[PDB]
JSON list of C-alpha atoms in Angstrom, two decimals:
[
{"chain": "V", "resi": 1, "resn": "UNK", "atom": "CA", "xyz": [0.00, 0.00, 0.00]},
{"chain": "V", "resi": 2, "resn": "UNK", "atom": "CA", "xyz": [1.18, 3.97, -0.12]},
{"chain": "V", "resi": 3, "resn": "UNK", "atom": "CA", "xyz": [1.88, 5.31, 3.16]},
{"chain": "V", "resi": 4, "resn": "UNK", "atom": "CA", "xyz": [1.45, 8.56, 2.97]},
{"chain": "V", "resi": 5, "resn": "UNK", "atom": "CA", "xyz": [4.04, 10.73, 5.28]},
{"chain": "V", "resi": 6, "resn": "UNK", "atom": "CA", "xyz": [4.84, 13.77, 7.47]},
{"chain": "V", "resi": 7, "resn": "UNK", "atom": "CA", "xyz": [7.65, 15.08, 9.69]},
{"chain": "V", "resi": 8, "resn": "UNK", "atom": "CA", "xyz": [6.45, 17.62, 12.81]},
{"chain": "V", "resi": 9, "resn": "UNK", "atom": "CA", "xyz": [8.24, 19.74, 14.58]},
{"chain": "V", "resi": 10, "resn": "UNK", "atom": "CA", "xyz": [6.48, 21.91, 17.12]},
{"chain": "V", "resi": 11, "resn": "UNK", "atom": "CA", "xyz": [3.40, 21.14, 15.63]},
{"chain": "V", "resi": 12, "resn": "UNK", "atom": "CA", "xyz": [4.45, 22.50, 12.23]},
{"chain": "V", "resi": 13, "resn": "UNK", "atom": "CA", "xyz": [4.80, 20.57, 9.19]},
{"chain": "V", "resi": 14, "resn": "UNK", "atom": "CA", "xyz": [8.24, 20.04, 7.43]},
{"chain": "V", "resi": 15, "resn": "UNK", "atom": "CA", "xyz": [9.93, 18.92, 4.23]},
{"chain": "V", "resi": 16, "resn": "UNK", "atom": "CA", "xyz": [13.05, 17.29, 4.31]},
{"chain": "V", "resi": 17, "resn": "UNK", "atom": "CA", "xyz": [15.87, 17.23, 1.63]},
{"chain": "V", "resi": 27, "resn": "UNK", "atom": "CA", "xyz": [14.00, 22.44, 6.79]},
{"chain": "V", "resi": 28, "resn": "UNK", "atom": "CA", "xyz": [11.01, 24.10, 4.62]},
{"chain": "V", "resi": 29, "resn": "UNK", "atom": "CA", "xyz": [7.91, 25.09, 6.35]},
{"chain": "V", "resi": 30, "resn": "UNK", "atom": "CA", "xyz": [4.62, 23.60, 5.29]},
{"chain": "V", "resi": 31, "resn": "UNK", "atom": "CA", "xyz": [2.20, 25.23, 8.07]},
{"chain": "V", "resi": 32, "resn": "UNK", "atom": "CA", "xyz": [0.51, 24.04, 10.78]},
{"chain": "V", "resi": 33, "resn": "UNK", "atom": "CA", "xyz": [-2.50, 22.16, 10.03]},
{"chain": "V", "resi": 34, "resn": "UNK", "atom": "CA", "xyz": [-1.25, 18.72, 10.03]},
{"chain": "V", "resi": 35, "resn": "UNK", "atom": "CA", "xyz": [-4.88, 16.98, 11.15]},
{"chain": "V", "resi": 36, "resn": "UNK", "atom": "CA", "xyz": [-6.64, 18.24, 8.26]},
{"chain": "V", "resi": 37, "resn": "UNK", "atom": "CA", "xyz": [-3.46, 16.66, 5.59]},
{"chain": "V", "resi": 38, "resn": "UNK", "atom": "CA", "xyz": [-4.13, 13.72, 7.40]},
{"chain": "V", "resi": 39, "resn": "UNK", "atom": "CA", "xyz": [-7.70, 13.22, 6.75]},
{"chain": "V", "resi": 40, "resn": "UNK", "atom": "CA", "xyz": [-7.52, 14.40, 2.86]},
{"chain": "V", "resi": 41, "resn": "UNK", "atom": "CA", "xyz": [-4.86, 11.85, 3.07]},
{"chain": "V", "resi": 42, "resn": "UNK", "atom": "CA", "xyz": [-7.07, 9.35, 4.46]},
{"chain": "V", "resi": 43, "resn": "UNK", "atom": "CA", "xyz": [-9.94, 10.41, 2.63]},
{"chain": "V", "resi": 44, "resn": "UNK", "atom": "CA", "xyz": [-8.01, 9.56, -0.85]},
{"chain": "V", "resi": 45, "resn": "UNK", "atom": "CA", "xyz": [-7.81, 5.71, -0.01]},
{"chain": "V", "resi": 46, "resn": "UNK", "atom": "CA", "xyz": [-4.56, 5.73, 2.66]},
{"chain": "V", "resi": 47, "resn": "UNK", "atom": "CA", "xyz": [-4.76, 2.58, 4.80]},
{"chain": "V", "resi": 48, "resn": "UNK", "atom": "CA", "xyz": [-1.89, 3.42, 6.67]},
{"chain": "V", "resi": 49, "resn": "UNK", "atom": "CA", "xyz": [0.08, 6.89, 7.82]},
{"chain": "V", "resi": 50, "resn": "UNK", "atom": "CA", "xyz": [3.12, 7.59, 8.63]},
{"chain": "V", "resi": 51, "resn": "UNK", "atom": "CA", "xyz": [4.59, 10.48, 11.05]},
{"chain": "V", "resi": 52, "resn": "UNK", "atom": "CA", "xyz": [8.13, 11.61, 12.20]},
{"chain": "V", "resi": 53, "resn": "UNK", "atom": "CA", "xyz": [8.50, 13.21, 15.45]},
{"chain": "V", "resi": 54, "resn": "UNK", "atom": "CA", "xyz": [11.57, 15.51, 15.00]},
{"chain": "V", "resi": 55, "resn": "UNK", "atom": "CA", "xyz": [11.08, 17.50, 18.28]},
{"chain": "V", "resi": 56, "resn": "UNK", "atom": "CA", "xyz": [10.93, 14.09, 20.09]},
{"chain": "V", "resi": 57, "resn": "UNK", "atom": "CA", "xyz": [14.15, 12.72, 18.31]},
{"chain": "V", "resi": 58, "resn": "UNK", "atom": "CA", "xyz": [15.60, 16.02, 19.26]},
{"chain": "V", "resi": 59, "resn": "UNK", "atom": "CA", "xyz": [14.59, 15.58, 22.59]},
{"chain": "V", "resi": 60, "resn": "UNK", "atom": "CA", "xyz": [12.83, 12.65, 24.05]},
{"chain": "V", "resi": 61, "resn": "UNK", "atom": "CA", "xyz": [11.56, 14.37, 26.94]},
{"chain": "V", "resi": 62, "resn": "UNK", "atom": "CA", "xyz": [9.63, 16.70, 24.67]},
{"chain": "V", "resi": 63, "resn": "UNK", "atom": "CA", "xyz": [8.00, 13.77, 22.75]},
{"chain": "V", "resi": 64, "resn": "UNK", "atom": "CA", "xyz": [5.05, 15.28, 20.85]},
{"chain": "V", "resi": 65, "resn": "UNK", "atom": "CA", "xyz": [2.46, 13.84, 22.64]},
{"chain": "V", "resi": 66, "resn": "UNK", "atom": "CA", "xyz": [-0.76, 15.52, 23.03]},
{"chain": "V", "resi": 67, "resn": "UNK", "atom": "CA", "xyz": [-0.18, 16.21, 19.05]},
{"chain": "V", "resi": 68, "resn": "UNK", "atom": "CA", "xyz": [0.08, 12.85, 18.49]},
{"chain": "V", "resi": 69, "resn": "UNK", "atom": "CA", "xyz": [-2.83, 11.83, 20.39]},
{"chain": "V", "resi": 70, "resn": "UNK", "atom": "CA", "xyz": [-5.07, 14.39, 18.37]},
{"chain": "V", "resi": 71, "resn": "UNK", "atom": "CA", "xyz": [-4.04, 13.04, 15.26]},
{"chain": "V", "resi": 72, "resn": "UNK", "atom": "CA", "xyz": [-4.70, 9.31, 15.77]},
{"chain": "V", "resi": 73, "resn": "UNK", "atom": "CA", "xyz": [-8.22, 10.01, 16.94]},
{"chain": "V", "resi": 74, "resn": "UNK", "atom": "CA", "xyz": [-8.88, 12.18, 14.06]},
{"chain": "V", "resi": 75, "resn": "UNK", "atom": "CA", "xyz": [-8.28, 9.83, 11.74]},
{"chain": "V", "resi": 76, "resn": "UNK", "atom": "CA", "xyz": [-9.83, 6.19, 10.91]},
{"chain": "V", "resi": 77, "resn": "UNK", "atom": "CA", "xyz": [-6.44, 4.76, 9.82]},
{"chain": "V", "resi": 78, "resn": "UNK", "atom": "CA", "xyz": [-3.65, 3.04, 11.66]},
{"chain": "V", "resi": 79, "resn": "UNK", "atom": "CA", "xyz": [-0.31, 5.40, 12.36]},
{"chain": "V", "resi": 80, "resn": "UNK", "atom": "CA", "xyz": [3.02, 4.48, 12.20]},
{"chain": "V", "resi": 81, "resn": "UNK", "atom": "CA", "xyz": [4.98, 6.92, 14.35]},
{"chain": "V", "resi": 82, "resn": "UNK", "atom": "CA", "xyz": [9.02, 7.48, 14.51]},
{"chain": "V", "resi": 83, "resn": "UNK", "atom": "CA", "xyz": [11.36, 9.64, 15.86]},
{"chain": "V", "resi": 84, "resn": "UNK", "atom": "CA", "xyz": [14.19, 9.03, 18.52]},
{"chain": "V", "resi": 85, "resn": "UNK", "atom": "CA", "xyz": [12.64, 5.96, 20.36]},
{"chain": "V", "resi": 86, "resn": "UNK", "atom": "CA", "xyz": [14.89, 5.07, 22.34]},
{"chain": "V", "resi": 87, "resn": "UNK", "atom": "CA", "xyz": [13.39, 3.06, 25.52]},
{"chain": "V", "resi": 88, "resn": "UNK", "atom": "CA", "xyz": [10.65, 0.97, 26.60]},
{"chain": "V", "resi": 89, "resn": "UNK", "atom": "CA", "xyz": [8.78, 3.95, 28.28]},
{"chain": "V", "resi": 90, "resn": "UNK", "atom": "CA", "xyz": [8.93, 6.04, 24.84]},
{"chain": "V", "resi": 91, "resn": "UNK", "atom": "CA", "xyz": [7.48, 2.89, 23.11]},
{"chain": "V", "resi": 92, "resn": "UNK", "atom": "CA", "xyz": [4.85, 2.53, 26.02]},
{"chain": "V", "resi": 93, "resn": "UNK", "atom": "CA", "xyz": [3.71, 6.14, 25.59]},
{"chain": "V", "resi": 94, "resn": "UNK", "atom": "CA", "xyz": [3.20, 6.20, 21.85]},
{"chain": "V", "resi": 95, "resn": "UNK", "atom": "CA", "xyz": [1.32, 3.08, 22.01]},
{"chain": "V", "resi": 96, "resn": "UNK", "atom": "CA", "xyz": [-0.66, 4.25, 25.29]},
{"chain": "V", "resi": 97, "resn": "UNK", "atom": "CA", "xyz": [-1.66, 7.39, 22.88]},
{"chain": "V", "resi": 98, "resn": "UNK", "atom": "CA", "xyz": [-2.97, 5.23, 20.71]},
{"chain": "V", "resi": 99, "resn": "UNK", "atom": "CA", "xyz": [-0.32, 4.79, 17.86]},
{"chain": "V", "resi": 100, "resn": "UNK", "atom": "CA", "xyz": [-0.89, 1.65, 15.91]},
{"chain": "V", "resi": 101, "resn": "UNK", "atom": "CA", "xyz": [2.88, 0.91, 15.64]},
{"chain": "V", "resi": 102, "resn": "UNK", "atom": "CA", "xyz": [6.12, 2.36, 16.88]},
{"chain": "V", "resi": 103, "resn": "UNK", "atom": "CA", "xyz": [8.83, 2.78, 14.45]},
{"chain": "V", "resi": 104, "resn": "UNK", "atom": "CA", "xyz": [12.77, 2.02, 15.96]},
{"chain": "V", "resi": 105, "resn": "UNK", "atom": "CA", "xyz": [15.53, 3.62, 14.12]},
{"chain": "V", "resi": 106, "resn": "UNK", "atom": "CA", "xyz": [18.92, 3.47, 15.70]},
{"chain": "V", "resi": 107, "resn": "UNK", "atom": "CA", "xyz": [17.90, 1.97, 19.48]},
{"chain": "V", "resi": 108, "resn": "UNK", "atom": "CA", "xyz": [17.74, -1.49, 16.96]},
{"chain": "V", "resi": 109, "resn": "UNK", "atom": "CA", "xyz": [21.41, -1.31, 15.64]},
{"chain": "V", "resi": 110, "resn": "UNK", "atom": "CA", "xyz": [23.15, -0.29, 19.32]},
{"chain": "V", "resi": 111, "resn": "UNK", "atom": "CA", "xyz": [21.09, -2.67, 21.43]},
{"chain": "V", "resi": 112, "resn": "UNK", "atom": "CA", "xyz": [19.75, -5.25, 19.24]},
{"chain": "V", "resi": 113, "resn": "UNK", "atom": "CA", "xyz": [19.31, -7.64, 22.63]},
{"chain": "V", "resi": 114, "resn": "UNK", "atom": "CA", "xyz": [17.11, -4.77, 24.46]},
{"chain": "V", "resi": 115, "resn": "UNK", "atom": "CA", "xyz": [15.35, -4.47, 21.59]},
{"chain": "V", "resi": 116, "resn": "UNK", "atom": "CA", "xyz": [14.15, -7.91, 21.39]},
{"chain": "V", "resi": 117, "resn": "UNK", "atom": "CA", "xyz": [12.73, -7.99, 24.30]},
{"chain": "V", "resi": 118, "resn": "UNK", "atom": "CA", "xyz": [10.45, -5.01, 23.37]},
{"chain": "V", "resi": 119, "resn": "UNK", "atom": "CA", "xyz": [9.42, -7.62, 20.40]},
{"chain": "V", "resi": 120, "resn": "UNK", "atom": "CA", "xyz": [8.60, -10.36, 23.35]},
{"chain": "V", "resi": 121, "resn": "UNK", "atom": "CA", "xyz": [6.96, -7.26, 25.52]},
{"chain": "V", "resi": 122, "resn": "UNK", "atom": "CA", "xyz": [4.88, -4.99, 22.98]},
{"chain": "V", "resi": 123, "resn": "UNK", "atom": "CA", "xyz": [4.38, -7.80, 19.76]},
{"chain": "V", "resi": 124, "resn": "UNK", "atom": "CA", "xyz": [6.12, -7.95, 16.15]},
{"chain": "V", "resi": 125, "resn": "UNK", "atom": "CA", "xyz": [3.01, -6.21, 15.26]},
{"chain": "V", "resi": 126, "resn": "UNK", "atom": "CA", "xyz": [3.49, -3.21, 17.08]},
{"chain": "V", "resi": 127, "resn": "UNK", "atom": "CA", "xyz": [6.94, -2.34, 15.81]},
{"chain": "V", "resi": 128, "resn": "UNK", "atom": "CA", "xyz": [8.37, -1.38, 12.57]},
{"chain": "V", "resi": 129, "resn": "UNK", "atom": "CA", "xyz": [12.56, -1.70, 12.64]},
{"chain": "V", "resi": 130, "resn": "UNK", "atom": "CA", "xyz": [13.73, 1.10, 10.26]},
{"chain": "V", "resi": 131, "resn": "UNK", "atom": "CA", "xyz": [17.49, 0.69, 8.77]},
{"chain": "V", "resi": 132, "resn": "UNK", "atom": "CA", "xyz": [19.19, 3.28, 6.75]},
{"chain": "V", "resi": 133, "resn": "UNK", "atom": "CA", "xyz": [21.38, 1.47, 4.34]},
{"chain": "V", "resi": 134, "resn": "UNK", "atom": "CA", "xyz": [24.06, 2.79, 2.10]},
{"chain": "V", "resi": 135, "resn": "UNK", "atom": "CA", "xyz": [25.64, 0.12, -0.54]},
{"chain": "V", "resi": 136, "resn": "UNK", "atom": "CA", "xyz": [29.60, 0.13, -0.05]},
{"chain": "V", "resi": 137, "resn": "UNK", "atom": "CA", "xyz": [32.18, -0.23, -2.75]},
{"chain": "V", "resi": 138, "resn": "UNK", "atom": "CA", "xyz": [31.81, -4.00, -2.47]},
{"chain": "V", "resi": 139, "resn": "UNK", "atom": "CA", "xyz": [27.92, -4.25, -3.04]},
{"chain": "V", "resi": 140, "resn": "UNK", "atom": "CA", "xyz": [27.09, -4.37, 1.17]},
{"chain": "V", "resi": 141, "resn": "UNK", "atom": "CA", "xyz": [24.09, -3.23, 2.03]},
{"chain": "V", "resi": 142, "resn": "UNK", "atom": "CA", "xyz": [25.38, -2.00, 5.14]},
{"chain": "V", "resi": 143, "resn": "UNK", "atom": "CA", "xyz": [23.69, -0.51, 7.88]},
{"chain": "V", "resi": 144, "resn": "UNK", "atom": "CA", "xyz": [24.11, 2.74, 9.72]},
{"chain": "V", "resi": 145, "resn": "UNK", "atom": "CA", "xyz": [22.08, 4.93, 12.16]},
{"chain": "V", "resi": 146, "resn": "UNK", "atom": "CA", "xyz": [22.01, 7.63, 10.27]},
{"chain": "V", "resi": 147, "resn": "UNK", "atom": "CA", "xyz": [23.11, 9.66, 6.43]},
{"chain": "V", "resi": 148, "resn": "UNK", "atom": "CA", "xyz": [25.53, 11.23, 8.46]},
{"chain": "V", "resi": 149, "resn": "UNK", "atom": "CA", "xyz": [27.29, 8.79, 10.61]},
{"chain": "V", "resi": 150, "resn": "UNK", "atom": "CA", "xyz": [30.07, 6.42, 9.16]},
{"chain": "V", "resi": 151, "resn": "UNK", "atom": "CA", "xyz": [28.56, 2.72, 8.34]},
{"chain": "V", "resi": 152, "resn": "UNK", "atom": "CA", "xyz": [28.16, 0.63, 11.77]},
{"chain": "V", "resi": 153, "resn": "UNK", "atom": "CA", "xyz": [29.17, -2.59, 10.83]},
{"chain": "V", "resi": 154, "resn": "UNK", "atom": "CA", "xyz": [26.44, -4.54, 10.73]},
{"chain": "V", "resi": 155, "resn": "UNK", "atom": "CA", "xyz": [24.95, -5.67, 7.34]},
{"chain": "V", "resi": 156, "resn": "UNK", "atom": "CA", "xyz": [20.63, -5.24, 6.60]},
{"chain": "V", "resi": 157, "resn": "UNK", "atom": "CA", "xyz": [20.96, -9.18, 5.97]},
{"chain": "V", "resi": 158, "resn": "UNK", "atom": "CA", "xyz": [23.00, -9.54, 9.10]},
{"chain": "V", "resi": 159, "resn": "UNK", "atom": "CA", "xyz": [20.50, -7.52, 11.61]},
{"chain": "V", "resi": 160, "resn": "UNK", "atom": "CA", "xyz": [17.49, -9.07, 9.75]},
{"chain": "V", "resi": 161, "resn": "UNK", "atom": "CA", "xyz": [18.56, -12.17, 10.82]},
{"chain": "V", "resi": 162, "resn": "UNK", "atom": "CA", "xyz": [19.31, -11.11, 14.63]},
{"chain": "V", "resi": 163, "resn": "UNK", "atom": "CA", "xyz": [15.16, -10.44, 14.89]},
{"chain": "V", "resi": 164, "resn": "UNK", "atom": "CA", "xyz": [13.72, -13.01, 12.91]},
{"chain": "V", "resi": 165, "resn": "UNK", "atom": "CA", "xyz": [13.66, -15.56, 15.51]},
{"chain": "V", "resi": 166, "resn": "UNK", "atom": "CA", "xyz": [11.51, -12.77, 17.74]},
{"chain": "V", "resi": 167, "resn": "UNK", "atom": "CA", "xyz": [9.35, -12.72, 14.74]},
{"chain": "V", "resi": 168, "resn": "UNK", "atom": "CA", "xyz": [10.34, -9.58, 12.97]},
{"chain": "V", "resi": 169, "resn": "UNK", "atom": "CA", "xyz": [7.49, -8.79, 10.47]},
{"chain": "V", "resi": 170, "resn": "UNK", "atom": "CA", "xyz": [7.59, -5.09, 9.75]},
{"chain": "V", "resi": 171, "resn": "UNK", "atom": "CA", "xyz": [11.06, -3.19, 8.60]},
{"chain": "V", "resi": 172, "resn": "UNK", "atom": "CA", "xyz": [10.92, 0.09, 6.68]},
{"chain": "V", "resi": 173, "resn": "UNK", "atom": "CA", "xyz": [14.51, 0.40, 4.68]},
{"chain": "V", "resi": 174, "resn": "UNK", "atom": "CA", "xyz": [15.60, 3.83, 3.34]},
{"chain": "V", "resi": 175, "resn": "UNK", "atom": "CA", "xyz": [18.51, 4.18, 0.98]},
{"chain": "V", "resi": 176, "resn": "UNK", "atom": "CA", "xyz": [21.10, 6.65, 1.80]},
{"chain": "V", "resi": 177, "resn": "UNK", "atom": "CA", "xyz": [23.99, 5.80, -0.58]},
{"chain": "V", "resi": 186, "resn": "UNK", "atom": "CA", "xyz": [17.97, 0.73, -5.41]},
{"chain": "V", "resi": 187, "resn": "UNK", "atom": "CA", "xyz": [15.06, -0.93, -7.29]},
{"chain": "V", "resi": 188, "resn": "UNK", "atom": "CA", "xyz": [17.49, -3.81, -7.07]},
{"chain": "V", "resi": 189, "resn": "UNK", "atom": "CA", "xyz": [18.11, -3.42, -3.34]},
{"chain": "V", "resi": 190, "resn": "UNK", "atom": "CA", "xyz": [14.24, -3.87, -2.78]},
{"chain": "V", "resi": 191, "resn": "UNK", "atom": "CA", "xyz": [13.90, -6.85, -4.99]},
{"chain": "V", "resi": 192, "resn": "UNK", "atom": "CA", "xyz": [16.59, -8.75, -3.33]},
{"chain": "V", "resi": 193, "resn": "UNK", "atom": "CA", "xyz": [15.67, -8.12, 0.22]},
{"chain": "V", "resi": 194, "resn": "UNK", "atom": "CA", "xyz": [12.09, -9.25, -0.12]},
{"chain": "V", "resi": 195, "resn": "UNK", "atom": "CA", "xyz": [12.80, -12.04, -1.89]},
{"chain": "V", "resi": 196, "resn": "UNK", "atom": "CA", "xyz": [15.27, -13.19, 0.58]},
{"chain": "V", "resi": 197, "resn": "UNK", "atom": "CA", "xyz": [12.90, -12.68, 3.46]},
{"chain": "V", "resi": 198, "resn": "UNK", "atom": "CA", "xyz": [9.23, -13.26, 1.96]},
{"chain": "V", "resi": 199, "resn": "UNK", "atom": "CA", "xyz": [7.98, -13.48, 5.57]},
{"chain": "V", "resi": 200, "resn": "UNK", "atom": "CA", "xyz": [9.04, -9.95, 6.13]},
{"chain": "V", "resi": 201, "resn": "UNK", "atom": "CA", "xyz": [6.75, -7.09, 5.05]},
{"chain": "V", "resi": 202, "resn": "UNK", "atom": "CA", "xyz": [9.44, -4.21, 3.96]},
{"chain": "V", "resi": 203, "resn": "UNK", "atom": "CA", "xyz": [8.45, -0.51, 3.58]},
{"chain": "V", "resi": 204, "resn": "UNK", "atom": "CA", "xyz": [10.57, 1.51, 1.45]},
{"chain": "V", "resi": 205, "resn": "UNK", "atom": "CA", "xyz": [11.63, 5.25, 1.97]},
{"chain": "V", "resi": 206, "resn": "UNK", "atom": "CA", "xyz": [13.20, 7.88, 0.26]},
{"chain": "V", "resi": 207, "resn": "UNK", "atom": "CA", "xyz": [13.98, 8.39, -3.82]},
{"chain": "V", "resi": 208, "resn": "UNK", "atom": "CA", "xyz": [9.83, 9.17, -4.82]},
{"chain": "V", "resi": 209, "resn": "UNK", "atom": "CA", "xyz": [10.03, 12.25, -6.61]},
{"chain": "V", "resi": 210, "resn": "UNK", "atom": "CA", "xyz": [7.69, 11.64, -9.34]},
{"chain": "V", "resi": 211, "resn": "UNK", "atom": "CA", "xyz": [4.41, 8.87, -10.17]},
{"chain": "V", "resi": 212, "resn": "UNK", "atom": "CA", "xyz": [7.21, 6.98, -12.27]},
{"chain": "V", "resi": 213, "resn": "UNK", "atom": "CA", "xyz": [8.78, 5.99, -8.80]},
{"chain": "V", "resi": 214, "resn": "UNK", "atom": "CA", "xyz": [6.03, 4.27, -7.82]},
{"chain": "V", "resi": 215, "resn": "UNK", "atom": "CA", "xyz": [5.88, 2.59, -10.41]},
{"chain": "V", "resi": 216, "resn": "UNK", "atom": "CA", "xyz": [8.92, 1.13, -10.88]},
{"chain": "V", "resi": 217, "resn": "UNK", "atom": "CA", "xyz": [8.45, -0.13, -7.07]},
{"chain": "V", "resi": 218, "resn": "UNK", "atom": "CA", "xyz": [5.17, -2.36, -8.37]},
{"chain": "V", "resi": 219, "resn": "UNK", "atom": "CA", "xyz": [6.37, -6.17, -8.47]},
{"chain": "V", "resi": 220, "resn": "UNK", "atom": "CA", "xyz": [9.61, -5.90, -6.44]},
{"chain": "V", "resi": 221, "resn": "UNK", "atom": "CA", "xyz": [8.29, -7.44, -3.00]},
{"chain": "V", "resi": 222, "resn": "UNK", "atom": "CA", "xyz": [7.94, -3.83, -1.48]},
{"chain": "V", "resi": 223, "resn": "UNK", "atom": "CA", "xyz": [4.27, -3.87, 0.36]},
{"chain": "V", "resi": 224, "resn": "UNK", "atom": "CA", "xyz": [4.62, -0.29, 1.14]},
{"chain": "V", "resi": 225, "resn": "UNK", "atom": "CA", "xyz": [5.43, 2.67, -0.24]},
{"chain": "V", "resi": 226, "resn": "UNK", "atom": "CA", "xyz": [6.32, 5.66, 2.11]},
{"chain": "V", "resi": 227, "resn": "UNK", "atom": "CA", "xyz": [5.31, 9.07, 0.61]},
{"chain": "V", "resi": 228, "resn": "UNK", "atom": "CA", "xyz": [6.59, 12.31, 1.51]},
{"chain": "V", "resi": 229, "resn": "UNK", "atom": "CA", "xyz": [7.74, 15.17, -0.04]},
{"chain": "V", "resi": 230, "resn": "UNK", "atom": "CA", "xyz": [6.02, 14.39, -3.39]},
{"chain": "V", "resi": 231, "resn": "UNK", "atom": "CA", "xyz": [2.71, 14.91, -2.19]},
{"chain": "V", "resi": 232, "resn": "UNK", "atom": "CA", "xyz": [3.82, 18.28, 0.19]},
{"chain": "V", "resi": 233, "resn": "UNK", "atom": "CA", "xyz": [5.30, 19.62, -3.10]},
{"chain": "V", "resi": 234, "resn": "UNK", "atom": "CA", "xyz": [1.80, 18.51, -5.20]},
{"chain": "V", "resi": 235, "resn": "UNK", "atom": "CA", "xyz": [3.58, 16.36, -7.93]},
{"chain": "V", "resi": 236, "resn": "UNK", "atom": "CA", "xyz": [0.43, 13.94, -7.34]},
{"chain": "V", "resi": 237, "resn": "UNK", "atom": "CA", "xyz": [-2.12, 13.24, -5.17]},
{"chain": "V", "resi": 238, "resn": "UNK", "atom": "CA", "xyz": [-2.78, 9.79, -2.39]},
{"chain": "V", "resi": 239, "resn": "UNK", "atom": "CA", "xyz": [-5.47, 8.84, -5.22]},
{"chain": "V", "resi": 240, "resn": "UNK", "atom": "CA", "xyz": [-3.68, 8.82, -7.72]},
{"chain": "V", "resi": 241, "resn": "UNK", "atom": "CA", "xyz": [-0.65, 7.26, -6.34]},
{"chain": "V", "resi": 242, "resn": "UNK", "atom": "CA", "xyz": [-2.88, 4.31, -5.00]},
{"chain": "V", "resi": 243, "resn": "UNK", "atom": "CA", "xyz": [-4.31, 4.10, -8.65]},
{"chain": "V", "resi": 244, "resn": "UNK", "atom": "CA", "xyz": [-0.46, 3.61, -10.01]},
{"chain": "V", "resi": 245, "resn": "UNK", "atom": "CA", "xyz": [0.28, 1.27, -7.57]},
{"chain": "V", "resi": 246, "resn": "UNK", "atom": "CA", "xyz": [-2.76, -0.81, -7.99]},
{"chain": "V", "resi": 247, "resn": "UNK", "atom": "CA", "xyz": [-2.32, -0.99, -11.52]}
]
């Protein structure tokens, strides 16, 4: 499906390359929504800043305003924060770099909250070998650890859900999914026009996050849905 997607900070919507968008993120949503979106997808960049200002009340606004699940990110980093966001009602929690440093903690949070309340997502950049290695972030060095590698390491706690953005790419997609069919992969990043969606249809991707594109009015949800339904 297309997951339509926005970044907040301080209640103000953002585009990412900050550029402001305004403030009225509830009513996106629900055009979003309204279009056909099963799913959503929000980053909390005041939270990742600063967990202790975790957005919330926002947060809890726009989950009740809307009839579709939410995917929420942004500098989770414990238990608690994963606890709070699902206490406000967000259908799953999204775990960036908390799942590369402390892959053991982590798993336990897969025991504790269920595979599906927790999306694991990897940056990977593609070395000078052809390793889709992993790092925390597009501007930290590689961390060691291969996407194959720390797939693996969560499997066994049932890992369903992983959301991969390249920061180094049709091909990447294809052979992840078909090396881990059980896995449902989200990709993220590189949609600048319909064509991109397109050329996503029939790798093994089952979602398609959606950003900028639709901030910028290149298309609409509805008519991305209609390319990637075919």
């Amino acid at each position: 499906m297309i997951i339509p997607a926005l970044d907040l900070i301080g209640g103000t919507v953002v585009r990412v390359v900050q550029r402001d968008y305004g403030n009225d993120p509830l009513p996106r949503l629900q055009d979003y929504a309204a279009q056909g979106a099963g799913v959503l997808h929000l980053v909390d960049l005041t939270g990742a800043k600063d967990p202790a200002k975790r957005q919330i009340p926002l947060i809890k606004t726009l989950v009740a305003g809307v009839n579709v699940p939410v995917q929420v990110g942004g500098g989770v980093r414990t238990e608690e924060d994963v606890a709070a966001l699902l206490k406000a009602g967000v259908a799953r929690v999204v775990i960036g770099s908390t799942a590369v440093k402390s892959p053991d903690v982590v798993k336990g949070w897969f025991e504790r909250f269920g595979a599906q309340a927790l999306v694991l997502a990897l940056d990977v950049r593609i070395d000078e070998h052809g390793t889709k290695q992993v790092a925390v972030s597009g501007w930290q060095e590689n961390s060691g650890v291969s996407l194959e590698q720390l797939v693996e390491t969560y499997l066994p706690v049932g890992l369903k859900h992983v959301l991969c953005t390249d920061i180094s790419n049709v091909s990447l997609y294809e052979e992840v999914c078909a090396r881990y069919p059980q896995i449902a992969f989200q990709s993220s990043g590189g949609i600048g026009d319909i064509d991109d969606i397109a050329a996503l249809r029939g790798t093994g991707v089952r979602g398609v996050i959606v950003g900028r594109a639709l901030l910028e009015g290149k298309f609409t949800v509805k008519e991305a849905i209609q390319c990637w339904q075919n």
